[PDB]
């Protein structure tokens, strides 16, 4: 599959991203939640 496997690996690149930014985002929504309602 060549490039496709590499691109599949690129789509896993994003998997670490969502794995990473979600924890960031999980406390951003509390940052935003308890900022907005403030």
């Amino acid at each position: 599959s060549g490039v496709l496997t590499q691109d599949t690996i690129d789509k896993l690149k994003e998997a670490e991203q969502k794995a990473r930014i979600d924890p960031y985002t999980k406390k951003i929504e509390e940052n935003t939640t308890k900022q907005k309602d403030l």
Partner: protein, 50 residues
């Protein structure tokens, strides 16, 4: 921290399919031809018995 180690784990143990299979192929190239060569070698041998 777990993710860090998991990444490090993968870095150490897990193979690249393309690089490995590609290198599987490069060896298989010489290997497979040698197989056909082996047949041909025998075929030449069997030739001189008129």
């Amino acid at each position: 921290l777990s993710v860090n180690v998991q990444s490090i784990k993968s870095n150490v143990i897990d193979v690249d399919y393309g690089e490995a299979m590609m290198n599987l192929m490069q060896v298989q190239l010489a290997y497979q031809a040698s197989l056909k060569a082996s047949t041909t070698i025998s075929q030449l041998s069997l030739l001189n018995y008129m």
